[PDB]
């Protein structure tokens, strides 16, 4: 019953009679399972902030590190995770990859209360939170199997889009629930509900430069989503950031949707190019907002500039993905025309190739959510400035926009 042996999505008759209904149902359970995995992935971006408030004495370098490490394991587990769905099947893997997330969620619910818990423990739990970051790879591969090649866009769009919204959901919930264990426990009932719901409701089917472009855009969304709260507390220790810090990732997520549509409207490489300009320009204006020696800083501006870095990292993600998508469509066109084949064959293989390549592009891309906050770690621990790290980002976004020129346009 759970196993499907005759799967013909490219066949309209099949889709009408049963495919659409089955694929639709798998999507609807896939989505909550994915956003939840994002919630768990970015935990410390609301937990490392509250660690001293409960009596833990850790360096800011030790609080940024815990916020950075999930993206190391996440990145390393994305390649394997993409091979898991063909091996174990969508339903078995969704249930497992969603279920095992209770381990790290419960653990740090305890460890945060016992004020004598070593740093070595918190390293492990954060690294186990990185497992949830790999779920994206498997979830996305799974969906690509359920949908025909020319429906695939929207469904993949819905899956990753609403999944990414998981960061923003946690940022909003973890403070509200804290009235600590609460931030890390309120998802155990939801993880379980949806491990069960997958198990009984889902089905088992029987260019390095583009890594750099995705790294610069998505790795930045996740990188900022991790370290922003922690940064807006060493720069403005007076303001309680966890009633604003969700709005960043939320706005960034919505910017993905716009990114792709805008990109096909006036050029994937153009919107990418113009966006890195806005990504360096906005990296610069953040110097003027800081509380520096003698000079009084401004929060409103600092916050609004980050709210513009989240927007610009969001657009860039949906802009680089349409770039990749378009590059692969062109390559598959040329090979098939040379083989003397079908426009249909080309369309299918362009979809296959963009999906097979994703488990590797999003692995390289996820390395950014380690660097950005570990940059704020090493900068604010060598000096007393975020400037040292923030200077490297500015240099990087320039290095990227020259690279988009050098190869495209």
């Amino acid at each position, epitope marked *: 019953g759970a196993v*499907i*042996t*005759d799967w*013909r999505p490219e066949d309209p*008759a*099949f889709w*009408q*009679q*049963r495919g659409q*209904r089955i694929a639709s149902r798998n999507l609807w359970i896939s989505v909550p399972c994915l956003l939840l995995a994002f919630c768990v992935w970015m935990l410390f971006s609301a937990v490392a902030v509250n660690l001293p408030k409960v009596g833990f004495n850790f360096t800011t370098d030790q609080l940024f590190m815990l916020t950075a490490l999930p993206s190391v394991s996440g990145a390393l587990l994305r390649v394997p995770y993409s091979f898991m769905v063909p091996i174990f099947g969508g339903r078995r893997w969704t249930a497992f990859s969603t279920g095992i997330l209770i381990i790290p969620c419960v653990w740090l619910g305890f460890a945060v209360q016992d004020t004598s818990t070593p740093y070595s423990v918190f390293i492990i739990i954060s690294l186990l939170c990185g497992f949830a970051g790999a779920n994206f790879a498997s979830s996305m591969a799974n969906i690509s199997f359920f949908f025909p090649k020319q429906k695939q866009g929207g469904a993949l769009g819905l899956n990753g889009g609403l999944g990414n919204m998981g960061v923003s959901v946690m940022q909003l919930v973890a403070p509200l629930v804290v009235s600590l264990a609460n931030a890390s426990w309120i998802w155990v009932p939801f993880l379980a509900i949806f491990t069960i719901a997958a198990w009984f409701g889902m089905n088992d089917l*029987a260019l390095w430069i583009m890594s750099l472009l995705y790294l610069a855009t998505f790795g930045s969304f996740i990188g900022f989503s991790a370290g922003f709260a922690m940064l807006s507390k060493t720069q403005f220790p007076d303001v309680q950031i966890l009633q604003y810090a969700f709005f960043g990732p939320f706005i960034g997520a919505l910017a993905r949707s716009a990114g792709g549509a805008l990109s096909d409207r006036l050029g994937g490489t153009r919107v990418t190019l113009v966006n890195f300009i806005l990504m360096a320009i906005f990296s610069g204006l953040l110097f003027l907002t800081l509380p520096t020696d003698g000079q009084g800083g401004s929060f409103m501006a600092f916050f609004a500039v980050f709210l513009a870095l989240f927007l610009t990292a969001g657009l860039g993600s949906g802009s680089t993905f349409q770039m990749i998508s378009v590059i692969f469509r062109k390559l598959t066109m040329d090979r098939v025309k040379a083989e003397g084949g079908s426009d249909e064959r080309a369309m299918r293989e362009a979809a296959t190739d963009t999906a097979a390549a994703l488990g590797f592009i999003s692995a390289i891309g996820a390395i950014g959510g380690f660097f950005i906050p570990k940059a704020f770690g090493s900068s604010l621990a060598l000096t007393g400035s975020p400037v040292g790290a923030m200077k490297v980002f500015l240099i990087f976004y320039i290095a990227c926009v020259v690279i988009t020129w050098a190869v495209y346009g």
Partner: antibody
Framework: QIQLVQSGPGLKKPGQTVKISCKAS????????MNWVKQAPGKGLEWMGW????????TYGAAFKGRFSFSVDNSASTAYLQLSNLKTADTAVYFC???????????WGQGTSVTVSS | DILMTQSPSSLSVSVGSSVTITCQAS??????IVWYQQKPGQAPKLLIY???TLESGIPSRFSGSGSGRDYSFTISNLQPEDVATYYC????????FGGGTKLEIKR
């Protein structure tokens, strides 16, 4: 309690039309396709085609294009086979059967025997 | 159209004996094969789908295997109730029945 129950035996002269029905019950009718199978006396099962129960679209095997019609009444949750200009060779038992794709023909009707004779 | 040759067309086998029916497709049917049991005057009954997956309630004495163009079906501990005509069917491109195998039991 999944069941397909078909109408009863009919006798007809050559030149006439017959319409056999098949009531499905115990399952959501529009989720599964309906196949029709012919068995002439002392012959093997012969697949006639199916009808998509979302489309209402028919698909006919080569030998059954012309005088054959699959139709559908979704609200009655039943399927029909219409045979026009009956020939003697149409004498057979006719089965409806659920499913084109996963578990093909996993539930059968009891069959409906048609005799073409003067 | 994809053709299906079924062998044998009839056989007589002892109680507790093993039957083997083979089916050859005219081209690759990519594991989409089903097997039916047709006791006379009754409605056919699906035993196996997708080469080897037994329908629920169907006794373990039944089995199937194959790939590409070649498939077989087996009844191992033959009981008197197993008397019937058996059919393979291809449901790859359209559907095609095998010609049948009328199984007589011996006593």
């Amino acid at each position: 309690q999944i069941q397909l129950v078909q109408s009863g035996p009919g006798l007809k002269k050559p030149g006439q039309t017959v319409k056999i029905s098949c009531k499905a019950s115990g399952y959501s009718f529009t989720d599964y396709g309906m196949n029709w199978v012919k068995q002439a006396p002392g012959k093997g099962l012969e697949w006639m085609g199916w009808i998509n129960t979302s489309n209402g679209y028919t698909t006919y095997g080569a030998a059954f294009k012309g005088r054959f019609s699959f139709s559908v009444d979704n609200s009655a949750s039943t399927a029909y086979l219409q045979l026009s200009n009956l020939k003697t060779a149409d004498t057979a038992v006719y089965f409806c059967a659920r499913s084109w794709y996963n578990r093909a023909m996993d539930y059968w009707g009891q069959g409906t025997s048609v005799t073409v004779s003067s | 159209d994809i053709l299906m040759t079924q062998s044998p067309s009839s056989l007589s086998v002892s109680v507790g004996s093993s039957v083997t029916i083979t089916c050859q497709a005219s081209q690759n049917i990519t594991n989409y094969i089903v097997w039916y049991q047709q006791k006379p005057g009754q409605a056919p009954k699906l035993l196996i789908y997708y080469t080897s997956t037994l329908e629920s309630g169907i006794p373990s004495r039944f089995s199937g295997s194959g790939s590409g163009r070649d498939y077989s079906f087996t009844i191992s501990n033959l009981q008197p109730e197993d008397v019937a005509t058996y059919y393979c069917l291809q449901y790859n491109s359209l559907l095609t029945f095998g010609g049948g195998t009328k199984l007589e039991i011996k006593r």
